Design a protein around this ligand. Structure first.
Ligand code: ADP
Ligand code: ADP
Ligand code: P3S
Ligand code: P3S
Ligand code: P3S
Ligand code: MG
Ligand code: MG
Ligand code: MG
Ligand code: MG
Ligand code: MG
Ligand code: MG
Ligand code: MG
Ligand code: MG
Ligand code: MG
Lengths: 442, 442, 224
């Protein structure tokens, strides 16, 4: 944890002339404002203010004044800004005029579930995300095209894979920002890319994801490309998800890892798996929040389709990578990169604690390709399906109690409400598909 | 009813040189073959044959030989063919190599329900359809555009309404074919048109609808236009439905019309209304068979949204026009022009007979604008909603028993099966809407 | 600079229909020499009665100074409801629908933010206007109507007439006439500036009154 004179010393020592205070609305979009260094004890005295009317999911126009309280632990400088315009950043939580934190701030809300988990004996909730993304070419006037940067596949090399330097450039700015980058490569789909980085505290992991996406889209544009984290932007090729590798620690204890078992898993980790499977239908709407999200949750693309766990398996909802030890984890593959990381985490966490709190029994693993399983054959072993559309996700959300717990009223309410207009709007448009499949035949 | 020497005399007297035998597959598409007059006792001896493998909804490639049995009552000549190439037409039912009628022929299937209704005391099942349609401009190479012929509205005149002569031309060919045309006008939406004609026997009414559409699309093309019966081809304007005005007759008895009641309805007509409301969810999938069909079953466009009846009302599922007397009818507004007329009729008929057979009690009428009714306020008076998507229509179909009765196994089965692939295919594509609403924001 | 970036900056009140207009909010205060004469540290509100008298001031005369603070025909396509621009004469704290908003900041930051002004206004005239409107409320010590602490856009005519909320002038012409009866504004600009602003803008209006929009041709030229 950093001091207030910690960051006072930092702005002198590096001559940081501008400060970007950041936070996150309900859809997971970074929102921020730049302030000259001149203003640094307004920001440090927490007297920074903004307008909640114009933030989706926050507040009404008559209740609109809101405050930013910076979190000094988040401090970081941008390795490409420098000189007369060197820029530094602080992520903030949102406070009301009360002086009290805002019930509707996704991030403070994660901090809230994390106390419900340190009350059950655990030090940290560690997350390692796998945010995949596509790269599209830009046109003369700087706007995206439907033309992917390459037509390469998994682990391909240049010139089959042309995102090489862009990913390199992304990595070095990320590296020069504090990330421990783990790997960088081309994923399965044409123009699809992956850059993995090391796990971190529940809150700082999401802080990481929201910075990750900021850097991907900014460098991508400099390379004359458009980066999208849209779950499934083209039909018939792999979508891109955000796999959430997750683990509880008892202070350098990997509490999921039993060191003499042959499969190497404690069963407080077994019970965790039980709760996320019990509540999977419940939280899908926050881990798959677009209508586009469900066009990626169809079989055949290494995306979770049915609710089940297995090891060394990319067909199921929950993989347990072969890696054990301090790296023993469960990878939750449903989440896609459009999900609000802070909220997706609170849902998965509380879903896993109501799995231990309730001492729940794990189901048996499906060590098969689930996509090759007959509907009746999978109904035989009793495996549920995930919601097939955002509407069905929504209604499964208002049935599940564990999710309202994880999100609270203001967020739970402002979410069902907003994602139901996006469904209404979408269930009125006429797709090129119908017109293309119906207007001449009928 | 006509004789075989009836039509022998007809081909001599007019010198009809070509014969078009017609029938209908499961999606309501006219299928036919032209035969020289040379072949007229092959056709009359029922020795005409074709291939059921290549007809959707019929039969397998190993069971493929099928026969046509013409229905001589249907005879009609085309008032635009003449001379060396004068053409005449006979609608046929499909028979197997058995000699027995094909279980899967929508039309013979209507004839089958009609015997289940003359066994309950009624002479005819009379239908008057209102098939609405749009007119799109063609381009240089003869292919449709998204440009409507006019930007007129209801009952408009030229030059605001430019479909005048086309509709005229349609009417005179229709008139010269035996239709008693009733009215012709521009309906609510831009480039939308209506041409009503007088009611007829259950079977000949559908025979009429399938000819209607044939003539609309043929004249429309000569006028350099493209006619579509797509339910909802553009968002934000009125779709076009096929209102089914329906009545039972006891031989010139309008059995729906009570002549001293003030509202003028017998209650064998009241019980009929009860059964179509009891089974509405069941048969929607056949009266609204496209995914496009449900983009028209959204509130605000004079299309049925919730299951309810009223009089003088275009907001509800079932209208009872002010017209009483020999014209007392219930108009069933859900049906849209993409529905197979023969099948839509069997569903609505059997739905209404299980309403009298079961002596069912009518509900109370909603004499209001149902679209202005709060969701909870309409849940208060207990009015169901129609299926919001073709998938929900399908599953409501496999629950309802009255519909499997109306369609039989081969048709019921071949329908759930085929319209579920069209849903699968459609619930995999990525709409310009998502890419347009998601690819830059995420 | 915007040009040096191949861009074009405009302070036009609402260059585009259907999205927020750009307004030039005037947060103002009165000082008695290093101390914010708007801020009472004892009371819970945070406001002295000079701040109350002062806003009673601008509220009372808002109709009169509106033409000067919203001086283009375009100005009045921003005073449409629903875009965080005001269109009713009212005041609230913490609230962005009303004419005057008073921010949560107190201490040396206590102030009234007059949301009416748009960036097309002549700052020295608008400020001269608001200052004397306030100065009127201070030397007649008017007492302030009670605040309107809801979204003032979602209120019906019946619901606003009840509480006594006057609209601001809908058009520039109507704003000019509001300007000719309000006498406090005439002393604010002086005879010379008052007259020539009125002239200049009266004839600006006449030119707009006679234009034919292609709004109109896109509606009436095929319909009628
Ligand atoms: N104990 C752990 N808890 C949480 N995350 C972990 C743990 N061990 C490793 N990880 C995370 O797993 C991720 C590895 O992802 P990746 O290498 O793409 O896996 P794979 O390719 O097998 O799916 C890293 O992001 C890292 O943070
Ligand atoms: N007794 C009846 N039974 C069945 N159909 C009828 C009866 N009387 C009239 N019709 C039909 O009603 C239709 C009238 O449709 P239309 O004039 O467009 O009605 P509206 O415009 O009021 O909806 C005709 O197609 C006609 O066949
Ligand atoms: C080869 S893949 O395994 C495919 C990811 C998939 N497109 C998804 O939607 O999660 N994922 P990874 O190697 O990143 O764990
Ligand atoms: C004015 S309308 O009443 C509108 C028909 C609507 N578009 C529908 O989908 O049925 N129908 P009609 O006058 O043909 O009975
Ligand atoms: C949310 S807004 O509050 C919008 C004001 C708008 N531009 C207008 O005055 O039309 N402005 P700000 O928070 O900068 O005061
Ligand atoms: Mg808002
Ligand atoms: Mg650098
Ligand atoms: Mg990986
Ligand atoms: Mg993974
Ligand atoms: Mg076939
Ligand atoms: Mg002719
Ligand atoms: Mg009509
Ligand atoms: Mg009708
Ligand atoms: Mg402001």
């Amino acid at each position: 944890t950093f001091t207030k004179e910690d960051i006072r010393k930092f702005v002198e020592e590096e001559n940081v002339r501008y400060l970007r205070l950041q936070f996150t609305d309900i859809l997971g979009t970074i929102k921020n404002v730049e302030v000259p260094v001149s203003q640094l004890e307004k920001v440090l005295d927490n007297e920074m203010m903004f307008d909640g009317s114009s933030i989706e999911g926050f507040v009404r126009i008559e209740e609109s004044d809101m405050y930013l309280h910076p979190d000094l632990d988040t401090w970081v400088i941008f390795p490409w800004t420098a000189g007369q315009g060197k820029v530094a950043r602080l992520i903030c939580d949102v406070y009301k005029t009360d002086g009290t934190p805002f019930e509707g701030d996704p991030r403070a809300n994660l901090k809230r579930v994390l106390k419900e988990m340190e009350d059950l004996g655990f030090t940290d909730f560690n997350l390692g995300p796998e945010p995949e993304f596509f790269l599209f070419k830009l046109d003369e006037k700087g706007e995206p095209t439907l033309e992917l940067n390459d037509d390469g596949g998994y682990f391909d090399l240049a010139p089959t894979d042309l995102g090489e330097n862009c990913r390199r450039d992304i990595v070095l700015e990320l590296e020069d920002m504090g990330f421990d980058i783990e790997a960088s490569h081309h994923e399965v789909a044409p123009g699809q890319h992956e850059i993995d980085f090391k796990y971190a505290d529940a809150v700082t992991a999401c802080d990481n994801i929201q910075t990750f996406k900021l850097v991907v889209k900014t460098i991508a544009r400099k390379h004359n490309l458009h980066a999208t984290f849209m779950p499934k932007p083209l039909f018939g090729v792999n979508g891109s998800g955000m796999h959430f590798n997750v683990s509880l620690f008892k202070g350098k204890e990997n509490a999921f890892f039993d060191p003499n078992t042959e499969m190497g898993l404690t069963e407080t980790a077994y019970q965790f798996t039980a709760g996320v499977l019990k509540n999977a239908r419940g939280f899908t709407a926050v881990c798959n929040p677009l209508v586009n999200s469900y066009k990626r949750l169809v079989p055949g693309y290494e995306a979770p389709c049915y609710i089940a766990w297995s090891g060394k398996n990319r067909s199921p909802l929950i993989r347990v990578p072969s890696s054990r030890g301090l790296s023993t984890r469960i990878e939750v593959r449903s989440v896609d990169p459009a999900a609000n990381p802070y909220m997706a985490l609170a849902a998965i966490l509380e879903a896993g604690l109501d799995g231990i709190k309730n001492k729940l029994k794990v189901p048996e693993p499906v060590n098969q390709n689930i996509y090759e399983m007959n509907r009746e054959e999978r109904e035989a072993v009793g495996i549920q399906d995930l919601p097939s559309t955002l509407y069905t996700a929504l209604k499964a959300m208002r049935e599940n109690e564990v999710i309202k717990k994880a999100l609270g009223n203001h967020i739970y309410n402002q979410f069902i409400n907003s994602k139901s207009i996006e469904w209404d709007y979408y269930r009125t448009q006429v797709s090129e598909w119908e017109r293309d499949q119906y207007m001449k035949q009928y």
